[PDB]
């Protein structure tokens, strides 16, 4: 990913990141939390480039959902169930009413 | 002819006049009390929708009392009290002789302090200026039965402090009932004797014959009454200070109210009036339950209103006073019981919000909360009601929504919370700053914990009416507030949603955007109802109803344009986003900006999300040109031209949004690079610098339409020269100054670098400034004057870079190879490009003849020596390099020109050392 | 107040009339004859719109019928593309330049919808087929011929409206070709 960033190929950055973080998403593993802090850096430090490409908007929407799903499983795996509910509500992927 | 500059500049100016017209609506919103000041009779105008999503108050969280305080309640021997100090972000509780200060912000920090005497009351006041250490941000006043103490709250940061005791003075056995302060640091006390006292305290001794640094004075004991006890007074039960009118008020234990001036410097205590609310009421009810009534409380009416204070009855009946008269009466809502016997114990008011707590059981209070709810006033100030001559002579324009809660534990105090800076906006203008302000939080402290209670904004209450998913309540809202303002609130919800977010470059401006409190489902429900409520732009005639006094000639009535509810909602959103900017100067007479970086970013985020809204809403259909207006059937051409004028006015508004972003962005960049160092140094004339406090954001938006280098270009003029004079990278900052606010800038920086080499000479630094100057020219090719650049390289003798530069610039004059293909019918584009390439390769031939001429000038002067051989070698070796640099080029005309020069120098040997197809 | 049904409002009623009947019937080609409903609906909106203003001709969507047959009646954009090829090849559209410009514009905006629904390698293999490509190139050549036949009688906004269309059709043919040669890699 840092090499693909060095040549500004941001579609592939989002493609790799979503592919490795989805397979890891629910896991209690060092690679999951290390890749999640790296993803929180890719957010802060590059999002203005990652959202401006003419491809990969869905790959960014997925990145901006996975970086919230990791934050939801962070709270579920740490008994913070009321804060976890508020993360998945404000993710809009589930229905709250009929 | 038609002129597209004139048309765009007229569109832009008409959209500025449209924004002035909308911003003076945002400014001029009327005081609703002005209609009501002359109603004799009780007010009852309570708004409801029959649906709970219309609640103007919501409980945000509850937090229970810390276990030290709860075990304090299990050990209380005589007395408790509860209180609130948002003026430091703390609650306070006192249990007999112990005082607790508790953090209700998300640190939880408790601080306990013990006294040797039972506590009577406690309050927090601003210190007298120059009187303590400057780290003493507040003074806490604690009364007991025997003494009164002044604690200096001395600060180590913004959230934590020392409780330093500094001064005490006896009570004289005067039980103190209430305690109030001023922004000069005056301190008033009320006694159970019915006197008002003040604390003369000072840093250094009050009188030159004494050691007093604290002293108590009675301010309402006239010098004869000490010798003639001609009745007691009443106990006083409340004190209030109206800072904004410079008035003290005091409420007495028979409902008698007294008013005193403190003077416009805090200079005085000067009694003005006694008011007798029960007599003032019975006077009205004899000029058109009750015999048990008392006034419970007094509260302030905002400075901007003709009302000065409110007094509140033991019935929920509110009494609105001018200093002259009782001027309106307001009944409770029917959420207070029809039996007319509710135990109302606590009553609070701040700036168009009102609360009553009333006891229901030994463990529960009913909290009734009302807000002034501006819907008819908001609607009739934006929408001209076509229902002419409505007889508004009896309509009570103080509309309130009433809300209802049950609360476990006895409500002991209420305050408003300090979630907003500078001043609270007066209730009938909350709408004007709604998008800049947080919701108006209240704090309700009771015998179990602290309830946090927000007043909803009209945007937040629309979000709840949309989350109801009820199409009828959303239709009710659009016709209750008006389609212009409901459209403005749908646009606000879209600006608060994820999908409106055009990002800023976080790599320079880190994270500060509008908090995204609105979900996608709510944002595009709001967009769907905005589309459904929009309508078309249409012409109308104003029906000027003639008064029946004769013909003498009528006027010709015009046709006039109604824009859509989407256009008017956009213009009523944009005017509120720009309201704090538009009428204000950007630069202080101190030489600094008027706004902070955080404020500039929040205005930038509103305008970028609104720019996103214009290109996602499709109100400007992408790729359509400016509609060219000309100078059953006829009433098609009515909408045909109305839709052209809306599309014109929308393009004018978009251009003003974009330029408002460009101005905020330029003032953010100028803030980083020390704004005042750029302002004081700038090439701006001294009598312009003496008037920049008079130059508004509005007037800067106009300034480039009327070279006249504008004030903005003359700050870029000092930024660029400040970066140069510190050797800072000027190009990182410029890529931002061209994405947010190429060739023409960089052609000057090439000329600037080459004018350092022509000043300082050839060295590894200045010879890099030559490498850098080539690569920058190539990065802007062919958009420069080649011959003027070639004479700079020739004046440096940096010859080796001129051949590549004259070849690349010749390629970028024809990046289609059109001059490479011989045509028996040449285009005039081909003739032009062929002449341009022949003029650029003529600079290589200018260089080669210059080098050959320098060689010949020196050989005509070395007339008696030997050693010149190396100078002769190196000169021909540079010529062979310049030849080979062209022989690599696929352009035949470069080749035929070099071959013509080799032949005209007689250098026929070199054709035997070349192989390229054009030689044959 | 003689209620003006707008050129939008006529299309809004007619689209609703076609879609809501199609939803109970499709794929009954007897009671919902898609090619006839297209060939008559487009001809009736052409005949109604011809005499209208050059901004009533900006309430009209190009995909007025073609989206709703997909959006509501669930007819595939591939199936619609060849019902429009049949409409243009079989129908009286070859008799008048203005009508041939109109239906060829609807056909290329229908192909612009299809280029936003194409996902798979298999679909990219259909859109690069010789039969689709040769229809697109015949349709561009036809429109480009008739446009330069009328570039002396048409007005200077409606000329630009067709010049902006030609650059789309040239891009659409370029996408049928890029999807052809993204097959060798």
Short mmCIF file of N, CA and C in Angstrom, two decimals, chain B residues 248-326:
data_model
loop_
_atom_site.label_atom_id
_atom_site.label_comp_id
_atom_site.label_asym_id
_atom_site.label_seq_id
_atom_site.Cartn_x
_atom_site.Cartn_y
_atom_site.Cartn_z
N UNK B 248 -30.30 45.92 39.47
CA UNK B 248 -30.57 44.89 40.47
C UNK B 248 -32.08 44.81 40.74
N UNK B 249 -32.59 43.60 40.93
CA UNK B 249 -33.95 43.29 41.36
C UNK B 249 -33.92 42.49 42.67
N UNK B 250 -34.94 42.65 43.52
CA UNK B 250 -35.13 41.82 44.72
C UNK B 250 -36.60 41.46 44.95
N UNK B 251 -36.90 40.18 45.14
CA UNK B 251 -38.24 39.64 45.43
C UNK B 251 -38.43 39.39 46.93
N UNK B 252 -39.56 39.83 47.49
CA UNK B 252 -39.84 39.79 48.94
C UNK B 252 -40.94 38.78 49.29
N UNK B 253 -40.95 38.27 50.53
CA UNK B 253 -41.92 37.26 51.04
C UNK B 253 -43.32 37.83 51.37
N UNK B 254 -43.84 38.61 50.43
CA UNK B 254 -45.24 38.99 50.22
C UNK B 254 -45.53 39.27 48.73
N UNK B 255 -44.65 38.82 47.83
CA UNK B 255 -44.62 39.14 46.39
C UNK B 255 -44.17 40.56 46.02
N UNK B 256 -43.82 41.46 46.95
CA UNK B 256 -43.33 42.79 46.56
C UNK B 256 -41.94 42.73 45.93
N UNK B 257 -41.79 43.37 44.76
CA UNK B 257 -40.54 43.41 43.98
C UNK B 257 -39.96 44.82 44.07
N UNK B 258 -38.65 44.95 44.25
CA UNK B 258 -37.94 46.23 44.22
C UNK B 258 -36.86 46.23 43.13
N UNK B 259 -36.63 47.41 42.54
CA UNK B 259 -35.67 47.64 41.44
C UNK B 259 -34.69 48.74 41.82
N UNK B 260 -33.40 48.52 41.58
CA UNK B 260 -32.30 49.43 41.91
C UNK B 260 -31.37 49.56 40.70
N UNK B 261 -30.88 50.76 40.40
CA UNK B 261 -29.79 50.97 39.45
C UNK B 261 -28.44 50.76 40.14
N UNK B 262 -27.54 50.02 39.49
CA UNK B 262 -26.14 49.91 39.91
C UNK B 262 -25.22 50.91 39.18
N UNK B 263 -25.75 51.68 38.23
CA UNK B 263 -25.00 52.65 37.42
C UNK B 263 -24.20 52.01 36.28
N UNK B 264 -23.93 52.78 35.22
CA UNK B 264 -23.32 52.29 33.96
C UNK B 264 -21.81 52.03 34.02
N UNK B 265 -21.20 52.22 35.19
CA UNK B 265 -19.80 51.88 35.49
C UNK B 265 -19.77 50.85 36.65
N UNK B 266 -20.93 50.32 37.07
CA UNK B 266 -21.09 49.64 38.35
C UNK B 266 -20.92 50.60 39.54
N UNK B 267 -21.19 51.89 39.34
CA UNK B 267 -20.81 53.01 40.21
C UNK B 267 -21.65 53.19 41.49
N UNK B 268 -22.79 52.50 41.65
CA UNK B 268 -23.87 52.93 42.56
C UNK B 268 -24.69 51.82 43.24
N UNK B 269 -25.56 52.25 44.14
CA UNK B 269 -26.82 51.57 44.48
C UNK B 269 -27.92 52.64 44.62
N UNK B 270 -28.84 52.72 43.66
CA UNK B 270 -29.83 53.81 43.54
C UNK B 270 -31.24 53.23 43.30
N UNK B 271 -32.08 53.16 44.35
CA UNK B 271 -33.44 52.57 44.27
C UNK B 271 -34.35 53.37 43.33
N UNK B 272 -35.11 52.66 42.48
CA UNK B 272 -35.94 53.24 41.42
C UNK B 272 -37.44 53.08 41.68
N UNK B 273 -37.88 51.87 42.07
CA UNK B 273 -39.30 51.51 42.12
C UNK B 273 -39.57 50.30 43.03
N UNK B 274 -40.77 50.26 43.60
CA UNK B 274 -41.41 49.05 44.14
C UNK B 274 -42.60 48.67 43.25
N UNK B 275 -42.76 47.39 42.95
CA UNK B 275 -43.81 46.79 42.12
C UNK B 275 -44.59 45.80 42.99
N UNK B 276 -45.91 45.70 42.79
CA UNK B 276 -46.82 44.99 43.69
C UNK B 276 -47.69 43.99 42.91
N UNK B 277 -47.13 42.92 42.30
CA UNK B 277 -47.78 42.15 41.24
C UNK B 277 -49.22 41.71 41.49
N UNK B 278 -49.58 41.34 42.72
CA UNK B 278 -50.96 40.96 43.09
C UNK B 278 -51.92 42.15 42.93
N UNK B 279 -51.50 43.36 43.31
CA UNK B 279 -52.26 44.60 43.09
C UNK B 279 -52.30 44.97 41.60
N UNK B 280 -51.18 44.85 40.88
CA UNK B 280 -51.13 45.10 39.44
C UNK B 280 -52.10 44.16 38.68
N UNK B 281 -52.18 42.88 39.05
CA UNK B 281 -53.16 41.90 38.53
C UNK B 281 -54.60 42.30 38.88
N UNK B 282 -54.93 42.51 40.16
CA UNK B 282 -56.30 42.84 40.56
C UNK B 282 -56.76 44.17 39.93
N UNK B 283 -55.82 45.09 39.63
CA UNK B 283 -56.13 46.31 38.88
C UNK B 283 -56.63 46.03 37.46
N UNK B 284 -56.06 45.04 36.75
CA UNK B 284 -56.52 44.63 35.41
C UNK B 284 -57.87 43.91 35.49
N UNK B 285 -58.01 42.96 36.42
CA UNK B 285 -59.25 42.20 36.62
C UNK B 285 -60.40 43.02 37.27
N UNK B 286 -60.19 44.32 37.53
CA UNK B 286 -61.22 45.30 37.88
C UNK B 286 -61.24 46.52 36.92
N UNK B 287 -60.68 46.40 35.70
CA UNK B 287 -60.75 47.44 34.65
C UNK B 287 -61.21 46.93 33.26
N UNK B 288 -61.50 45.63 33.10
CA UNK B 288 -62.37 45.11 32.03
C UNK B 288 -63.84 45.25 32.46
N UNK B 289 -58.70 29.26 44.72
CA UNK B 289 -57.51 29.56 43.89
C UNK B 289 -56.99 30.98 44.12
N UNK B 290 -57.34 32.01 43.32
CA UNK B 290 -56.57 33.29 43.24
C UNK B 290 -56.17 33.98 44.56
N UNK B 291 -56.99 33.98 45.63
CA UNK B 291 -56.61 34.60 46.92
C UNK B 291 -55.48 33.90 47.69
N UNK B 292 -55.00 32.75 47.21
CA UNK B 292 -53.85 32.03 47.75
C UNK B 292 -52.55 32.29 46.95
N UNK B 293 -52.60 33.08 45.87
CA UNK B 293 -51.46 33.26 44.96
C UNK B 293 -50.33 34.09 45.57
N UNK B 294 -49.10 33.68 45.26
CA UNK B 294 -47.87 34.44 45.48
C UNK B 294 -46.99 34.41 44.23
N UNK B 295 -46.06 35.36 44.11
CA UNK B 295 -44.94 35.26 43.18
C UNK B 295 -43.89 34.32 43.78
N UNK B 296 -43.54 33.28 43.04
CA UNK B 296 -42.49 32.33 43.40
C UNK B 296 -41.10 32.87 43.03
N UNK B 297 -40.97 33.42 41.83
CA UNK B 297 -39.69 33.81 41.24
C UNK B 297 -39.81 35.02 40.31
N UNK B 298 -38.66 35.65 40.07
CA UNK B 298 -38.39 36.59 38.99
C UNK B 298 -37.27 36.05 38.09
N UNK B 299 -37.29 36.42 36.81
CA UNK B 299 -36.29 36.06 35.79
C UNK B 299 -36.11 37.21 34.77
N UNK B 300 -34.97 37.31 34.08
CA UNK B 300 -34.67 38.42 33.15
C UNK B 300 -35.32 38.18 31.78
N UNK B 301 -35.87 39.23 31.16
CA UNK B 301 -36.23 39.22 29.73
C UNK B 301 -35.08 39.80 28.88
N UNK B 302 -34.68 39.17 27.76
CA UNK B 302 -33.53 39.60 26.94
C UNK B 302 -33.50 41.10 26.63
N UNK B 303 -32.30 41.69 26.60
CA UNK B 303 -32.04 43.13 26.47
C UNK B 303 -32.77 43.76 25.28
N UNK B 304 -32.84 43.01 24.19
CA UNK B 304 -33.40 43.38 22.89
C UNK B 304 -34.94 43.52 22.90
N UNK B 305 -35.61 43.02 23.95
CA UNK B 305 -37.08 43.12 24.12
C UNK B 305 -37.49 44.31 25.00
N UNK B 306 -38.69 44.85 24.75
CA UNK B 306 -39.32 45.90 25.58
C UNK B 306 -39.66 45.39 27.00
N UNK B 307 -39.99 44.10 27.14
CA UNK B 307 -40.06 43.44 28.44
C UNK B 307 -38.68 43.44 29.12
N UNK B 308 -38.63 43.62 30.44
CA UNK B 308 -37.38 43.78 31.19
C UNK B 308 -37.15 42.61 32.15
N UNK B 309 -38.21 42.17 32.83
CA UNK B 309 -38.21 40.96 33.65
C UNK B 309 -39.57 40.25 33.56
N UNK B 310 -39.58 38.97 33.93
CA UNK B 310 -40.77 38.15 34.13
C UNK B 310 -40.89 37.88 35.63
N UNK B 311 -42.11 37.90 36.16
CA UNK B 311 -42.43 37.38 37.49
C UNK B 311 -43.42 36.21 37.36
N UNK B 312 -43.28 35.17 38.17
CA UNK B 312 -43.99 33.89 37.97
C UNK B 312 -44.82 33.54 39.20
N UNK B 313 -46.11 33.29 39.00
CA UNK B 313 -47.07 32.98 40.06
C UNK B 313 -47.07 31.50 40.45
N UNK B 314 -47.51 31.23 41.68
CA UNK B 314 -47.89 29.91 42.21
C UNK B 314 -49.17 29.36 41.55
N UNK B 315 -49.11 29.25 40.22
CA UNK B 315 -50.14 28.78 39.29
C UNK B 315 -49.60 28.54 37.87
N UNK B 316 -48.31 28.83 37.60
CA UNK B 316 -47.73 28.81 36.26
C UNK B 316 -48.08 30.04 35.39
N UNK B 317 -48.91 30.96 35.89
CA UNK B 317 -49.17 32.24 35.22
C UNK B 317 -47.91 33.13 35.26
N UNK B 318 -47.39 33.47 34.08
CA UNK B 318 -46.21 34.32 33.89
C UNK B 318 -46.62 35.76 33.61
N UNK B 319 -45.94 36.71 34.24
CA UNK B 319 -46.23 38.14 34.21
C UNK B 319 -45.04 38.89 33.60
N UNK B 320 -45.21 39.48 32.42
CA UNK B 320 -44.13 40.14 31.69
C UNK B 320 -44.15 41.65 31.98
N UNK B 321 -43.08 42.17 32.58
CA UNK B 321 -42.99 43.54 33.07
C UNK B 321 -42.07 44.41 32.22
N UNK B 322 -42.55 45.61 31.91
CA UNK B 322 -41.70 46.78 31.68
C UNK B 322 -41.46 47.49 33.02
N UNK B 323 -40.41 48.30 33.15
CA UNK B 323 -40.23 49.17 34.33
C UNK B 323 -41.45 50.07 34.59
N UNK B 324 -42.20 50.43 33.55
CA UNK B 324 -43.42 51.23 33.64
C UNK B 324 -44.60 50.41 34.21
N UNK B 325 -44.97 49.30 33.55
CA UNK B 325 -46.17 48.49 33.81
C UNK B 325 -45.95 46.98 33.61
N UNK B 326 -46.79 46.17 34.26
CA UNK B 326 -47.19 44.86 33.73
C UNK B 326 -47.73 45.04 32.30
#
